[PDB]
Amino acid sequence: LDWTKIVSKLGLSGQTAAALTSFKKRNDEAKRILFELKQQPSNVDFAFYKSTLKNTAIVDKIQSDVSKFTPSKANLSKQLNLIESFEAKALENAKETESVVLAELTDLEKTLENIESXXXXXXXXXXXXXXXXXXXXXXXXXXXX
Amino acid sequence: RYEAQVRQHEQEQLASTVISKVQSELQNAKFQDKVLAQAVEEVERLFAK
């Protein structure tokens, strides 16, 4: 359910601090509005209002219309702006990171075994892996800057 | 609140008019009220003795 992992889910850039603060403030205020308000419809005390009204058939007609149906400021799920953006973000940020993590793990596993293995039989092969490991260090610095 | 105030004002006005009519009837020399007071005192003293 993560304040511990939700605030550190972004990258090294500080541009996501404004978007993460707006989503956390709207989510906390939405839960407090539903808990402070009553989860019932309406009381409509018509047992003591019909006999105490001055005009005849005044409180009885207003109680039948208020207990039926009325209008509210609601909307439907037709304007799914964030639903279409969530699927497109997974193909450019989540799916693209899978190929980068697979190439980084395969290059690091081959460089660890070549650095510990001799100097004529398994050397020329270790020199080729050392060139890819040296280029990986420059690519990692270019991806962070 | 308006129905309770209208009911309390009508009951207070009816009680004030009934109190003025009872005081005006006793000052007109009521013969039935004077004879009933003497008979009520003799019946109460005989029941306690």
Mapping DSSP onto H, E and C, the string for chain A reads CCCCCCCCCCCCCHHHHHHHHHHHHHHHHHHHHHHHCCCCCCCCCCCCCCCCCCCCCCHHHHHHHHCCCCCCCCCCCCCCHHHHHHHHHHHHHHHHHHHHHHHHHHHHHHHHHHHCCCCCCCCHHHHHHHHHHHHHHHHHHHCCC
Quick one: DSSP state of residue B48? Answer: T
Experimental method: cryo-EM
Contact status, residue A104 vs residue A136, Cβ threshold 8 Å? yes
- Residue B5, chain A, CB below 8 Å: the answer is no
Mutation target vs A (from B1, B3, B5, B6; most A CBs, 10 A cutoff)? B3
How many residue pairs bridge chain A and chain B with CB atoms within 8 Å of each other?
Answer: 5
* Chain A residues near residue B3 by CB distance under 8 angstroms: 52-54
Contacts of B4 in chain A (CB under 8 A): 52
CB of A13 less than 8 A from some CB of B: no
Q: Position A44: which residue type?
A: V
Which of chain B's residues have a Cβ under 8 Å away from the Cβ of A53? Answer: 3
B31 interfacial to chain A (CB closer than 8 Å): no
Contacts of A58 (CB under 8 A, 6+ apart): A50
